[PDB]
Every structure is written in C-alpha cells, then in structure tokens.
Design a protein that fits this description.
Two copies of one chain form a homodimer. By secondary structure, the first copy, chain A, is of the alpha+beta class. The first copy, chain A, has one domain: Cystine Knot Cytokines, subunit B, CATH 2.10.90.10. Chain A is elongated. The first copy, chain A, starts with a helix and ends with a strand. The structure holds a molecule of 3 linked components (NAG-NAG-BMA) (4 copies) and alpha-D-mannopyranose (2 copies). A molecule of 3 linked components (NAG-NAG-BMA) binds next to strand 4 of chain A. Chains A, B: It comes from Homo sapiens.
Chain lengths: 104, 104
C-alpha cells in the first residue's frame, strides 16, 4: 500500500459516497403530481423540491423516502382557453426529508 | 405593480429558471449502461456524471443531450463468484455536455 495508492482510492470512495441514496434537489413538474383536469395549466410549470435518489449497496434495494414535508409554492394557474384571470395560488408540493434503501 | 410584488415574482422566476433543461450532476449505475453479462460486478456500483434534465417551456418538448463527452472512471471489477482478483479498470461513461428541449 504505497501513498499515492491511498489518495486515489480515497477519492474514488468519496465519489462512491456522493452517489449514495440521499435527498437531492430536483425539478418536479406540478401537473404530474396532481389531477390536472381540463387543461388547467401552471406557470411556472415546474418547481424545485428535494427528492430521494442515488444508489444502494445491494441491488434489490431502492432509495425510498422515509419522511416527507410539504412546501407551499406560489404559482399561476392559467386555464387556456381561457378565462378569466390566472391567480397566485399556493400549491403544496412534497419535499422529501428522509431516505433509506429498502425493499421493493 | 408595487415594489414588494416585484421581488417575489423575480424570485419565482429564478425558481423557474433553476428547473430548466440543463446538464445536472447525477448518479449513474454503471451496470445499466452496458452489457453486464454473467454477473460481472462493479465497485463502486455507481459514478457521478453530468446528465440532462429539467423542464421545458412547451409540453411536447423533452430535455435531450445535444452533445456528450466520455469520462473515464477507475473502478473495481468483481466477478463473484468468483475469481481471480478484481482489477482497477478505467470505464468510459457518458458526460452530457449539451442539452436542449426537443421532439420527441
Ligand atoms: C414519499 O413522498 C411522496 C411524494 O412523492 C408521498 O406521496 C404522497 O402522499 C400523500 C399523502 O398520502 C398523497 O396525498 C394524497 O393524495 C390523495 C389523492 O391524490 C388524496 O386523496 C389524499 O387525501 C392525500 O392528500 C399524495 O397523493 C402522494 N403523492 C404522490 C405519491 O405523488 C409519500 O407520502 C411519501 N412517503 C413517505 C414514506 O413519507
Ligand atoms: C426539504 O428537504 C431538504 C433535504 O431533505 C431539507 O434540507 C435539510 O434541512 C435540514 C434541517 O434540519 C438540514 O439539517 C441540518 O442542516 C444543517 C445545515 O447547516 C447542518 O448543520 C446539520 O448537521 C443538519 O444536517 C439538512 O442539512 C438539509 N439538507 C440539505 C441537503 O439541504 C429542507 O429543510 C426541506 N425543506 C423544508 C423547509 O422542509
Ligand atoms: C446522449 O448521451 C447518451 C448517453 O446517455 C449517448 O448514448 C450512447 O451513445 C454511444 C455512441 O453511439 C453508444 O456507444 C455505443 O454502444 C454500442 C452498443 O452498446 C456499441 O456497439 C457502439 O460501438 C457504441 O460504442 C452508447 O451505447 C449510448 N449509450 C446509451 C444510450 O446508454 C448518446 O450518444 C448521446 N447523444 C448525443 C446527441 O450526443
Ligand atoms: C461534463 O459536463 C459538465 C456540464 O455539462 C461540464 O462542466 C462544464 O464545463 C464547461 C467547460 O467549458 C463549463 O463552461 C465554462 O465554465 C466556466 C466555469 O468558470 C464558466 O466561467 C464559463 O462561462 C463556461 O460556462 C461549464 O460551466 C461547466 N458546467 C457545469 C455545470 O459545471 C464538464 O466539463 C464535463 N466533463 C468533462 C471533463 O468533459
Ligand atoms: O381533488 C382534491 C385532491 O385530490 C387528490 C390530489 O389530486 C390533490 O391534489 C387534490 O387537492
Ligand atoms: O461489447 C463491446 C461493447 O459493446 C457495446 C457496449 O456494451 C460497450 O460497453 C461494450 O464495450
């Protein structure tokens, strides 16, 4: 075990660690998380919340949220066509606060 | 258009911008990007590369890579069972360097 050897391996592990199941910030399209009837739009269409992702030690395991809170995010509801008026509505979208690899 | 009004809207747009199609760093499981025959493992199993994602202005559009480079990432190949020895191999994994919303 030379000294140059260690550093690289180290670094590779840090790589491996940064890929592990955690709540990472992601872009969620609000339509796909609700009923979305009769072409009631959103603007903006998407929102930045934290979500679970990343790899697991064993294959059968998956990154699943173990806890979740719900942020409120002001958005414009546009029903086009057509009317009248889009209003500033606070929609509740799931922020994942806990994760763990699980079955499945 | 009051002054408090502006700030919030501003901020919401910045939200909207941060969700738009771009190359964002993500965790790729190396098995799923190759042949993966006869249970030839990897360790670590995953790797941090840049990939395309995010929302698009219109619905029919998707974030697609328009350019891609290929990073080389030293990994351990373990064929278990079983032998012999896992060796430090440089695998070539796709780093997305360009994106744009497209059809589809
Ligand atoms: C893990 O996070 C997900 C979000 O990705 C959570 O799923 C959500 O769970 C809530 C609460 O059960 C669901 O709200 C429900 O919606 C139904 C019908 O759409 C409504 O009738 C109920 O009254 C309720 O409000 C929501 O649908 C669901 N969202 C999804 C899956 O898209 C889940 O709760 C989280 N799980 C853990 C372990 O915390
Ligand atoms: C949405 O979920 C994200 C992540 O799941 C939440 O961010 C997390 O907030 C918690 C709050 O306790 C942070 O815990 C602590 O953070 C401080 C930061 O200095 C740290 O010193 C402590 O050791 C501890 O970790 C956590 O770090 C943070 N995670 C990330 C990645 O930002 C966020 O709060 C959730 N949104 C809301 C408002 O519920
Ligand atoms: C967008 O990025 C993707 C990666 O997610 C690129 O897909 C990859 O394209 C390369 C080059 O065509 C493929 O390599 C090929 O593999 C086949 C068989 O597996 C081999 O026979 C060929 O000789 C070649 O080396 C690779 O399979 C493919 N990877 C995927 C899709 O998982 C794609 O090139 C990028 N597109 C743009 C617009 O740059
Ligand atoms: C893998 O792809 C990522 C992103 O697709 C590459 O990161 C990007 O690298 C380019 C190199 O030109 C950066 O462009 C310039 O970055 C400097 C940073 O100070 C900035 O001042 C310039 O305005 C310009 O944007 C780009 O920012 C950067 N993107 C991110 C999000 O990091 C990365 O280089 C690719 N891996 C390899 C080695 O091919
Ligand atoms: O319909 C009321 C309730 O139903 C369910 C989900 O689609 C929620 O978004 C919605 O608020
Ligand atoms: O089989 C050779 C070549 O085939 C294709 C892909 O699976 C590549 O990963 C591999 O290198």
């Amino acid at each position: 075990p030379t000294f140059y050897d260690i550093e690289t391996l180290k670094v590779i592990d840090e790589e491996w660690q940064r890929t592990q199941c955690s709540p990472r910030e992601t872009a969620v399209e609000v339509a796909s998380e609700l009923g979305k009837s009769t072409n009631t739009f959103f603007k903006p269409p998407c929102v930045n919340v934290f979500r679970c992702g990343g790899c697991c030690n064993e294959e059968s395991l998956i990154c699943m949220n173990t806890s979740t809170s719900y942020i409120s995010k002001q958005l414009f509801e546009i029903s086009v066509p057509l009317t009248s008026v889009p209003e500033l509505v606070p929609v509740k979208v799931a922020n994942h606060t806990g994760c763990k690899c699980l079955p499945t």
